[PDB]
């Protein structure tokens, strides 16, 4: 039974239930994430920005099966084109807007990676990606408004690949946490 999360803490409790088993009901998790109405006071602790790039701020370590984190995107900050390491990845906007550009997996041949589509993710929307859907780049294209997003990955992963848009060639990247549970982790 899926109920509206009343608060971020409540959402987290609900996620622990949704991931209590071995499989993941993506549409249910997405619906639950979308249903949480972003309340800045509840996540201010995790919203630690860096002037130069987006930050990843661990919120909950999950139950072995998932991780929940907050990403903070300064004006003009964006990601590489990347995959998600065989994990489910949910992205819910808590503040601002993000542009998501989708790309197909490249062929072995070196070639320009051309976008298959793009969309604007708006406050409170929850998007979902996995490797079967494709690769993506996520960017805050705003000149004036920072963005904050809530990301859920299952299983947890701490590496992915970044892709060279000009060639499709990939390089492994180890992902780091800017903070964990509200504590800066240099
Ligand atoms: Fe991503």
Swiss-Prot record:
Pathway: Organosulfur biosynthesis; taurine biosynthesis; hypotaurine from L-cysteine: step 1/2. GO terms for cellular component: cytosol. Induction: By increase of sulfur amino acid intake. One of its GO terms (biological process) is cysteine metabolic process. Keywords: Dioxygenase, Iron, Metal-binding, Oxidoreductase, Thioether bond. It catalyses: L-cysteine + O2 = 3-sulfino-L-alanine + H(+). The keyword Transcription regulation does not apply. CDD domains: cupin_CDO (cd10548). The keyword Oxidoreductase applies. Its EC number is 1.13.11.20. Monomer. Belongs to the cysteine dioxygenase family. This is Cysteine dioxygenase type 1. It comes from Rattus norvegicus. The gene is Cdo1.
